[PDB]
Each structure stands twice: as C-alpha cells, then as structure tokens.
Write a protein that binds this DNA or RNA. Structure first.
Ligand SMILES: [Mg+2]
Ligand SMILES: [Mg+2]
Ligand SMILES: [Mg+2]
Ligand SMILES: [Mg+2]
Ligand SMILES: [Mg+2]
Ligand SMILES: [Mg+2]
Lengths: 410, 121, 282, 125, 99, 94
RNA sequence: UGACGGAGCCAGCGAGUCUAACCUUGGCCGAGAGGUCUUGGUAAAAACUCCGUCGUAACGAGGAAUUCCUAGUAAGCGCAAGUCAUCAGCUUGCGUUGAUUACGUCCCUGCCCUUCACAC
RNA sequence: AUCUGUUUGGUGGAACCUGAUUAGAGGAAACUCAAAGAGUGCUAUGGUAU
RNA sequence: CAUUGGUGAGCAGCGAAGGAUUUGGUGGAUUACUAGCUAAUAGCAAUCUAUUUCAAAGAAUUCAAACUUGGGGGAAUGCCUUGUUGA
C-alpha cells in the first residue's frame, strides 16, 4: 500500500495475482516502480506506481527472497535470498540483465551504498560481506559471530555458548557517510562496525531486563529444583482477579498474536536499525520500543590538530583583537561547542562573507554540522541564514564534489 | 450446512474454510465439504507438529527422538532455531525444516557418506 | 524449491489417487440428488448407507481445462523455449527458428553441450512454461517433443512432409500477431488432451480482426499444421499460405518432464498389436 | 586423535578431496609431490595458494589431495580449490581465527574462485 | 427449498430421504432408534402416551375432529415434531406389534 | 484469528475483493491523534475531488476536460464536424 | 600451426543366460543325417604435454549471391547407446578443450501497440 | 591347480507383498519397593456360647 | 603401497621431595551489600502471657454475584425461568 502523508490517504494499493504474503519491499528513487518479495513465491513482483499494474515478475531465485534494495544512483536492484546467492537486476533500460554472485551461506539482510557502488550482506554464518556491484567481486569481509552477545532462554536446555539460535545479524544499514555499518539481530547486542578497516567500533547492549527472556548469558543456579526452573512455573492461578487467571494461549504460537497467546516470555530482539539522515544518531526497533542512541551530548574532548598555542584563553584574545578568522579556526581545532558558539555569535555581520570565503576546506564539514544543529532550536534565524548564504555561495563547488561527506549536514 | 444449498455465501465460505485448513495441513483433501466434520480431528492438528513432521521426513526414528532433538536445539525452521516441540508447521514451511548448521547431527550425516567439508562448518 | 517441487508433485499424485477412489462416491451423490428432485426411490445400497445420507446434507452443497494447465489457464501468457539436439545441422537450426516464429512468445536457445537435467532445471528456475526440442535426419526435421513445466506432460511427435519456409523464393517476413487457432476433428478424450497441450502454447485473447490463423487438422492421426493470412473480401474469404507445412503424429505422452525417462506413460503408440491398423485414436 | 580437516574442490566433473593434518609440510597430489603435477605449463596454478600465504604456514601441516574426474585443466582447478579450502579450514579449527581471516582476505583478494565453486549454470535470455 | 433455513432445512432433508429409501431398504437397517437406557425411554413413552391421551380426551369432550391413526401407531401431536421424540421412542412399540 | 495465530501467521492471504469507501472533507489536523502538534493542514480532499470540469449544463454549449468551453453558435462548420468526430472516437473506446 | 616413432597422462553416459562374418582346399568317422579336424582368400579415449628424426585427368581451402549465431555460445576431439514413432548412406546421448565481437540504437528494414494523492 | 562351480552350514538382509505392533525395541541385578491373578497349606469346629 | 583403524613394545624431546583420567560432599558467587522475633510510633532477645480485658469503630434491595462450558441432537427423573392451585 502507498500512503500520501500530505492527505493521509492510501492513494493506491497493490496485490499479487496469486495471493502471496510479502515480507520485504523496495521503492525506486524516481518513485515510479515498487518491488516486493515473498517467503512463499520465490519471485520478486514489480508494480508501476502510477498505474498500479503488475509490470512484471522477476524470476531466477531458487529460494525465498529475504531482502531488496535499490541503488539511489545507478537504479539497479539487488535482491538476496536463502538461495546462498545475490542477484543484481538491471530492470531499467532496453535490455534486462542479471548478474548472480554466490555466497557461503544464507543471506538475511542487505544494505546498499548511497553511492550505489557496493552492497553489504549479512549471512547466517555471521558474516558481513561487501561486494562491488559493477565488478561483482568481493571487496571486504567482517566477522561478527564472536561479537554477537546472545543469552540463554529460561526454557533452553543448552548453553548460550553452544547455542546457535542467533549468532547472525538479521538487519544492517550503512551510515550515510558510507564508512560505518550498524547491525542488529535476534540477539542482545547492537554492533557498529567500520567498513574500511573491518573493525568493531562499539557494541551496545539492547536491554538489561530479566522480564525479557534473552537478556542473560548465565542464569542463576538457585532457580532450579528437581522439577526444573522456578520461573517456568506458571503462577497465574495465584492472581486474585479472574482475568489474570484466564489463559487464552494457543499451544504452538510463536509470533503474530497478543502477549497472552504465546504463553512464553518476550525475547529481546532487534528487528531493524537505521541511521538518522540529518543527525549523528541511529534508531533501533526492539521489543521494548525504538531505542534512539544519539551523540548530541558531546561531553567528549575530541580535539583536531592542536598545538601548544591553541587554548580557550587564546581564542578569546583573538576575538578581542578582532582576529575573527583565526578565532573561528582555533575554535574548531579545540572542537568545543561552547567555544564555537561564542565565536560564532561574536562575528559582526559585515565580516561574515570575508570569514566564510577563508575557512579552510578541512573544517567546512564541521561548521555546516554546527550551523545545522544550532539553527533548529536557536533564535538567530536571520543571523544563521546570513551565514548559510555565505558558506554555500563561497564553497558550493566543493560541497558538490564530495556529496557523501556533507550529506547529513546538508 | 443449515443455510440453503444454492446460496452464494454458503459457496464462498466453505471453499475458504477448506482452502485455509488444507493449507495448514489439517485436511489432506479439499474436495468434499463433509470432511469438515468427519475428517477434522485433534490428531489432524497434532500430525502437523514439528516432532511428527520430522518423523515423517525421516529426520528422526521415533516421535520421542524427534522431540529430544528440538529440546537439544538441533532443529531449525528457516533461519530461526526452535526449541518448542509444539510448533505447528504449515504445508509451506515443512520445506525449510532442517538441521542447524553446526549440529553434530549434520556432522554424522555428512561423515557417514564421507561428504564432510569443514570449510562450510 | 527442489523440496518444494518434490512435495507438490507428491500431493498432486495423492490427489489423483483419492479422486479415483472418490469417483464412485460422486456418482452415489448424483443418484441421491436425482432421487430427491424426481421423487424416484433410491437403489438398495444407498438406502441402507446411513453415513452417506448424513454426509449428503453437507455435500449437497457441491457443483474443462486440464489440471496442469488449470492454474494458469488464460491468466499468464506462456513462455516458450525452442531448442535442438546436439550439434544441429543448419537446416534444423533454420527450422527451429521457424517454430519460434510460429509461437508468439518463443525464444531460440542453442544446445551446445547443455545437459538435459541442467537444461530442464535451468528453464524451471526462469519460469519457462514450455520447452520444445527438435531432432533432424540429414537436414530433415524428424521429431518434436513438447515438455510442459513444472511437472509435465511431455508429448512427443514425429514430423512428415516437412516444408520449411526457406524453400520459397521472395517469401518475405512473417506476421507475429497473436494468431487465431483452428482445431478440427479432435474427438476422442486423448484428442482433447492434445488440443489442450497445443492450445496453451499460444497467448490468450487474439484480436477479433487478427490476421493470422494457425490450424491443426487431424486426418487419421496425422495432425496437419498450416499457417494462413487472410483478407476478408466482400463475397468470401481469401487466404494465403505462410508456412511451414508439416504433419505430426503423436507416439508418446508422459506424465513428467522430458528429462524423466521413468515418468509414467499416459499413452503410447502400439504398432505391433494385431489390430493396430483398424482404429485411429485421435 | 591427530587434528585433521577435510575439504572438497570441484570444477566441471573434476573432484578433489584434501585431508590437511598436523605434519611437516609434506604435500602430495595423488600420492606424489606437487612438483610432478602436470601439465607443466599450469603447474604454477596449483602453486597459487602455496606462494600467496607463504610457505611458512604449510611448514606445520601435511596435505593429501586425491583427485578424480574431468580433464587436465579442471583437475588443476580442483586441486587448487581443495588446497586453499583445506588450509583455511585447518587454520580455523586448530589455529587462531585471526590467521583464518588473514588467509581468507589474501585469497579473496587474489581470485575468489579458490574458495567459492565456479559453476557456470545456464541462464536463458 | 431455497428459502427454508435453520432446523427446518435439516429435519426436512432427513424426512425426504427416509420417504425415498423405505421401498428398497430393509426395514431393520433403515430406521434405527437411537440408543437410550431402559428407564429413560419407558419414561419418555409413558408421558408421550399421556399427552396424547389428554390431547384426544380434550378433543373428544369438545367437538374437535382428529385425523385417523392406525391402532398400533402413536398419534403424532405437535410435541412430536418440536421435541423430536420419534427418533427415541419410535413410531410404535415393535415388540407388541410382532405379537 | 485463532487459526492464523496457531500457524504463527504464515497463513495464505485471502482472495482480493473490491469495496467502496466514502471520504468526508475535513481539515487534515482532525485526522491525526491528539497532541500539541500538527503535521499537515491541507484538506482531506484534492482540488479535483471538490470540482472537476464536466458536462455543459446548457445543451448548446460544449465543455471539455481541459476547461475550454464552446457554444455551438460560434463554432464554424468544420469545427463542429471535427468535434463530432472527436466525440465518436472517445465514445468508441469506452 | 606438418609427418614418423617413443614416453607421461586426464572423463562421463552404457549391464536381458545377452553381442554377433562370408567364400574355399582336403583327411577321418558315420547306413544316412551329420560330427570333427585341416586348409587358402575376402570383409571387419581423443585432444593435450615431453623427447628424437626429416624438412616446408583432378586438385592446392573454395566466386557472386544467400543462411545462421551472443557464454560454458561458436568451433575442435573422442566414447557410448540404438529404448514400439524417425534413424545405421545415420540418429540420439555423454564428457573433454573453449574463444573473438556485441550486450547499445530505433538511423535503415520489418512486426506490434497507443492517441485515489503529489507532480506533470 | 592364475582348475571347475553346484551343494551343505555360517555371515548379511535390496525391492514388492503379507501379518502384528507402536510416547521404538531390549537386557541385567534384589534379604528393593509397589498393584493385581491362580494354586496350596493350616482344627479352619458356639445349630444357638463356662 | 596406504591406513586420519585397533591393540601393544620402545626411543628422541619436555621434565625442582612425581605425573595423568574420573568422581562424591560442602562452601562462595551467578541482581546492587540498611541485622532477628512479636500483638511493632515500642517490647523481647532468659521473654511476658497473674493487666490483654473493657470501651470506641464496624451490617448496600449488591437482599447482585460461573465473565471459567469441545461440536451435533435431546433431556424421563433432576436443576433454572415463568405462570397456576391450595394454605
Ligand atoms: Mg539487444
Ligand atoms: Mg558446434
Ligand atoms: Mg561430433
Ligand atoms: Mg545430430
Ligand atoms: Mg567434585
Ligand atoms: Mg448441548
């Protein structure tokens, strides 16, 4: 179904001929073609947005389709399956072509480089493999089985270490700069990897609640008796009110029903993860909800290219002596917000166009980020718009040449 | 049944009910409407439990032995491991029932035929 | 998929076995329905069968193209691959092209070292509906086999009086419009089965004024195949041959893909039976 | 039990079975050293793994490759695939996983065929 | 036939099939009274006779005219149709009829 | 519901059907949930949906979808033929 | 981009107590039928890699016109089977070695189709 | 005997078919603990109670 | 010739008043450390209980109360509802 957010009308609806359930979808950059995949049909359906007709069914997969994605630039379609394969479909153009690339194990998720030149895929073996689309050859690999933290469920009869329940990442996404991958799975960890050096930048624990089933690797020995785990004992009858005692559970249900139906504790799991297009933050859907991790606080001291002569005192002196360009530059090298904010607001309007044309190109990304975060909630709108008018006019050509560095700031 | 026979609503819903139950695997044939009372039984549902289906797919010797492998975490349906031996498998999902990749059982299967490749594992 | 294809075929065979068992019961219900309308008494066996009468109340509420084709009959246009045997002579390659032009939705594929299980499996992946293989003898086409995916049937034919279009001077180019179909003198149950196989290679829904007509005329088991282009005149119809001409005689029909040499034989031509000459099956 | 791992390489009909066990760099193909593998012109192809990751790693293992089927060229490709997969598998099982990653990265950097089967499956068009 | 719904459709379908079967179906097989213990059925028969006697006596004292019934068979009052007593007690006492 | 939950919601979807829904013009803000914020303020109907140029009310006039209106008196004879033919083809397709 | 010889070495299909010559010279045994022996004529994995030697009447790679062909494709090599129709003046399978050039364009030649938001 | 290859006995138990059974089928120990079945032994004796 | 088959007989090498395998019991952890009992604004911890009783407060016509049932057909005698007879 297509929704219009302007009028909140379901302005069109697509459905397959064979009555097939859909689990993954992708939308063309032009907003004129929509493709969906299924776990029952082994084919990728395609529809034309304007008409609603089923343009074509793409076939070639010998297993269910697990994820899809379009290239924002090249407009090719990458599809991965449990067929241990990935296929690149050049649907647009006079000739249709398919370029399959094989993989060691089942593919579960897929992420497309914003440039559109590479694709990362998470496999059941616990690997994030990066491939180059035009050459159809591997360019990198990142091991992830050891990083993934998975807990022992209370009902389980086997250790978490030996467990193979979830040592793989069912969702991944790139950072818009393109240098980082954030991954999540049916597990108790959200891992953030760095693509170029294939290393774990940081790991986050999703939850620390023992109401959820999968939080703990090691469970307390005291909880057993000759019967078994204490917590598996159902004490619903002890509840005084009838509605608490009544059990509506179906014996074999796993998902898709109310909490009452399943009869088993919810399991900590991250279905999807994404980076913020406009801020340095990422959101991860889980059982408890959308955990939004952000870098906004920035109490860290992360200086850039210091010398002994740079100091919070010196920059204030550079401001008093009316050396603004130095004062702003020394502000960035320290990379302190309160110091940047002061220097930003003390530059007179007559001097902004001169300062902007002389900011070193290396610091241009930082100022654009700072203006963006400050302007949303600041009160100096005409002051900001004067700056942005200055920067874009001065360094518009540079911003154009390196888009994927300045994308989030822009 | 009590609705009149030529009734179009009686036509549609009974076809829908058979198709759903047939897809779930509770009903083996979708030809006769009379099966809804004669051939709908608890055992018709029980036969679709994961322990029973593995036994029919010969993945185990007996239903008791099929259960023990579920509680031991050897059996997967799709890429999701299952320890619940009451998981009902639709007709469609009977095809993805398979051993876990690192399972000692797969090592015995592949070793028995001398087809073990340690790269995969 | 391979697990998918295996189980689907197993269920379908099981459905046939039950349907053959159900055939007796269906007639029993037909008798009960007629008795109620006419008021005529039921036969003795049905009278004493309490289980059937109880079942009848539910089964009172009950009500063509063949089963393999029923799912896609008139919905999805057929996808056709025309290939040949290994190392074809030029004439067979020319004839294989003519067959491709015959079916609107056909594509010619070269069989150089393709293995048959690989050939059928490759086509099953790509959603191919029908596969056609042609053989030849000294540059004369001899046999034609039509294999419907995913699970048959495979029908085999032998060609006689083959006249390709390249044997004509200044013939011109063909018309590739979705052509009308004529099937004449197919009477027996087997004959309908052959019409059912040949009919579904073509796209459904030709335009009423479509100017290309393909005729399969049975004359003593020898299906004449002709292609004509017609112009409606003020006082009749005038037609011209486009070709190719050839005569097909069925000699096998199996419930399976052409790869499966062990597939059940739905019908076969018995040539050494005493009474072979007397009856024409199609 | 001595540590040992087993791998298969396949190219067309050619199939190669490699056993890699703790040893002394005693490597043999069909019961003979590698240096006698034929045809001579393609011998360095079978040397591709040995030279890439360095002979030092093989100094602590013995490799036995038994090859059947296919022709000369497919046999050679089966041999090299089997050797590479066996080396990586043993390094995974009984050596650090860091060396496993290094080996895989070097191989997939040179030619991915050493690790993934090259199956030119038919594609209709 | 198309309009009738509810228990009427089920009961009517049963009566028709019985009316068609009885010529060719052997008497013992075609009509079998559902198993009920002794003390219950004798209670059901005793009362059903009692209502029929009251229904007949009330009509006799009045002028009402009632449809004829064979000597053995139970008169078929409204209660028979609603309460479906016939399946349980049966049309008549077979043992007395045989004697 | 019970069967779908029992099968872990890997059922087969129901056959498609077509139904009619009536939409009332309303400020878009009403359709949202109750909070001190609104996302859009446009109407719930598009400008075409309020009014689309249709038939000429006067039989003499001819009115097209582009909004061009025409009285039969002004039209020269050739235009009348051309428009009549245009009508013929439009009706034929429908 | 040869010939001769030697050496090394690599496949996959296929398993019906069923698989396969002809015409002669004579000896012996046998009532015969025939049996046995003797006798002359006629017919009936390859590529690849290494080593050694020689040595560069018709026809010497096929005109005009015309046909086919896009990846395990064109082309080269052998090995099997002969599966109620066809085939041995051969047909069908199997593996081995395996490329160049395009994968765009509607310019020509043919065929075909057309005249529920936002934005246009 | 790089002779011959049937038979007796041992080992093993493909396919089809038939029958029985089924939280697979067994095994061992006992001054062990239970729930049942059959048989056998015992003056087993108030016809109306010192 | 090969065993990445079993069972043994011995070396090289490692090598501080020995070495190796298996197992029963208890103790501490496996959630983030504000003390025990009682009739609890304090007593007791050796208990009192020979003051532990009196007083005060405290009773919905909700005078309702299976949210708890496998499907089909019934239900003599029961039970529920409604009306009726006579006290
Ligand atoms: Mg093209
Ligand atoms: Mg060729
Ligand atoms: Mg050849
Ligand atoms: Mg041929
Ligand atoms: Mg211990
Ligand atoms: Mg009831």
């Amino acid at each position: 179904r297509a929704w219009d957010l302007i009028r909140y009308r379901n302005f069109r609806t697509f459905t397959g001929t064979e009555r097939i359930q859909f689990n993954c979808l992708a939308v063309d950059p032009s907003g004129e073609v929509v493709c969906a995949g299924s776990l029952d049909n082994f084919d990728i359906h395609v529809w034309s947005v304007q008409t609603g007709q089923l343009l074509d069914a793409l076939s070639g997969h010998e297993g269910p389709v697990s994820c899809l994605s379009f290239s924002q630039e090249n407009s090719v379609l990458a599809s991965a399956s449990w067929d241990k394969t990935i296929r690149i479909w050049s649907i647009f153009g006079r000739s249709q072509q398919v370029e399959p690339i094989e993989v060691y194990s089942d593919v579960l998720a897929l992420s497309m480089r914003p440039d559109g030149k590479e694709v990362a895929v998470s496999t059941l073996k616990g690997q994030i493999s990066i491939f180059n689309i035009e050459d159809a050859k591997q360019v990198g690999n990142i091991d992830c089985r050891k990083d993934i933290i998975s807990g022992r469920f209370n009902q389980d009869r086997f250790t978490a270490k030996n467990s193979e329940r979830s040592k793989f990442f069912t969702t991944i996404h790139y950072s818009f700069d393109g240098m980082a991958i954030v991954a999540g799975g049916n597990n108790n960890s959200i891992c953030l990897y760095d693509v170029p050096n294939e290393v774990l930048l940081k790991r986050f624990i999703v939850s620390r609640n023992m109401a959820l089933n999968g939080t703990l690797e090691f469970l307390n020995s005291k909880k057993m008796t000759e019967a078994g785990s204490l917590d598996l004992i159902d004490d619903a009858g002890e509840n005084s009110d009838l509605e608490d005692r009544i059990d509506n559970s179906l014996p074999g249900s796993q998902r898709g029903g109310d909490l009452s139906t399943r009869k088993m504790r919810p399991e900590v799991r991250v279905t999807s993860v994404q980076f913020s297009p406009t801020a340095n933050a990422f959101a991860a859907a889980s059982t408890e909800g959308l955990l939004i991790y952000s870098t906004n606080d920035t109490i860290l001291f992360d200086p850039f290219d210091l010398d002994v002569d740079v100091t919070p005192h010196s920059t204030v002196e550079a401001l008093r002596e009316k050396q603004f360009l130095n004062a702003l530059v020394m502000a960035f090298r320290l990379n302190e917000e309160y110091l940047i904010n002061k220097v930003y607001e003390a530059i007179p309007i007559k001097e902004i166009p001169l300062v902007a044309s002389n900011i070193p190109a290396i610091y241009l990304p930082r100022i654009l980020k700072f203006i963006g975060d400050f302007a949303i909630e600041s009160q100096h709108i005409e002051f900001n718009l004067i700056w942005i008018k200055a920067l874009l006019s001065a360094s518009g050509g540079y911003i154009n040449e390196h888009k994927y560095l300045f994308s989030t700031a822009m | 049944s009590l609705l009149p026979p030529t009734d179009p609503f009686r036509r549609k819903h009974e076809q829908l009910l058979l198709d759903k139950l047939y897809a779930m695997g509770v009903l083996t044939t979708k030809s006769k409407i009379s099966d809804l009372e004669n051939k709908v039984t608890v055992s018709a549902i029980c036969r679709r439990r994961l322990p029973v289906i593995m036994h029919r797919l010969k993945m185990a010797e007996t239903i008791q032995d099929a259960v023990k492998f579920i509680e031991q975490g050897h059996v997967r349906v799709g890429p999701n491991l299952i320890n619940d031996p009451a998981y009902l498998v639709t007709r469609n999902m009977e095809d993805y029932v398979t051993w876990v990749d690192n399972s000692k059982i797969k090592k015995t299967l592949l070793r028995y035929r001398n087809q073990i490749d340690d790269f995969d594992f | 998929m391979l697990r998918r294809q295996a189980r689907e075929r197993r269920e379908y065979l099981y459905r046939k076995a039950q349907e053959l068992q159900d055939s007796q019961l269906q007639q029993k219900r037909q008798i009960i329905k007629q008795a109620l309308a006419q008021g005529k008494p039921l036969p003795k066996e049905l009278a004493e069968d309490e289980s059937l009468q109880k079942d009848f109340r539910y089964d009172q509420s009950l009500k063509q193209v063949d089963d393999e084709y029923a799912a896609t009959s008139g919905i999805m246009d057929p996808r056709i691959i025309v290939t040949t045997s290994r190392d074809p002579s030029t004439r067979l390659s020319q004839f294989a092209k003519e067959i491709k032009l015959l079916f609107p939705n056909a594509v010619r594929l070269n069989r150089g070292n393709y293995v048959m299980p690989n050939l059928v499996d490759a086509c099953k992946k790509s959603g191919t509906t029908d596969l056609v293989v042609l053989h030849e003898h000294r540059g004369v086409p001899t046999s034609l086999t039509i294999s419907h995916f995913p699970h048959g049937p495979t029908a085999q034919f032998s060609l006689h009086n083959v006249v390709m279009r390249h044997d004509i001077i200044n013939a011109g180019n063909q018309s590739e419009v979705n052509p009308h179909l004529i099937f004449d003198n197919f009477t027996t149950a087997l004959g309908k089965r052959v019409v059912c196989i040949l009919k579904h290679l073509f796209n459904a829904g030709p335009k009423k004024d479509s100017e290309r007509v393909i005729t399969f005329a049975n004359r003593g088991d020898f299906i004449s195949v002709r292609q004509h282009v017609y112009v409606r005149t003020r006082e009749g119809v005038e037609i011209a041959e486009v070709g190719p001409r050839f005569e097909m005689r069925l000699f096998e029909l199996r419930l399976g893909t052409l790869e499966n040499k062990d597939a059940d034989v739905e019908w076969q031509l018995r040539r050494f039976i005493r009474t072979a000459n007397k009856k024409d099956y199609l | 039990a001595v540590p040992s791992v087993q791998t298969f390489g396949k190219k067309k009909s050619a199939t190669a079975v490699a056993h890699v066990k703790a040893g002394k760099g005693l490597i043999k193909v069909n019961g003979s050293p590698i240096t006698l593998v034929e045809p001579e012109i393609l011998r360095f192809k079978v040397y591709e793994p040995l030279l890439l990751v360095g002979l030092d790693k093989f100094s602590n293992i013995d490799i036995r490759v038994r090859v059947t089927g296919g022709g000369h060229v497919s046999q050679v490709y089966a041999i090299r695939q089997a050797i590479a997969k066996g080396l990586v598998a043993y390094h995974q099982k009984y050596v650090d996983e860091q060396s496993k990653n290094e080996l895989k990265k070097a191989f997939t950097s040179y030619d991915r065929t050493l690790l993934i089967a090259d199956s030119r499956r038919p594609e209709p068009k | 036939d198309d309009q009738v719904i509810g228990k009427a459709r089920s009961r009517t379908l049963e009566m028709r099939l019985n009316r068609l079967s009885r010529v060719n179906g052997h008497q013992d097989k075609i009509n079998k009274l559902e198993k009920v213990p002794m003390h219950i059925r004798r209670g059901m028969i005793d009362k059903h006779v009692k209502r029929i006697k009251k229904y007949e006596q009330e009509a006799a004292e009045g002028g009402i005219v009632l449809s004829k019934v064979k000597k053995g068979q139970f008169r078929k009052i409204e209660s028979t149709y609603k309460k479906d007593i016939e399946r349980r007690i049966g049309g008549s006492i077979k043992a007395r009829d045989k004697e | 519901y019970k069967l779908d939950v029992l099968s872990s919601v890997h059922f087969v979807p129901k056959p498609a059907s077509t139904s009619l829904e009536i939409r009332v013009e309303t400020p878009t803000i009403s359709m949202e949930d109750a909070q001190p914020l609104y996302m859009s303020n446009a109407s719930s109907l598009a400008p075409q949906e309020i009014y689309n140029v249709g038939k000429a009310e006067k039989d003499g006039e001819i009115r097209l979808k582009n909004g061009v209106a025409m009285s039969k008196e002004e039209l020269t004879r050739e235009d009348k033929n051309r428009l009549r033919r245009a009508l013929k083809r439009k009706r034929s397709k429908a």
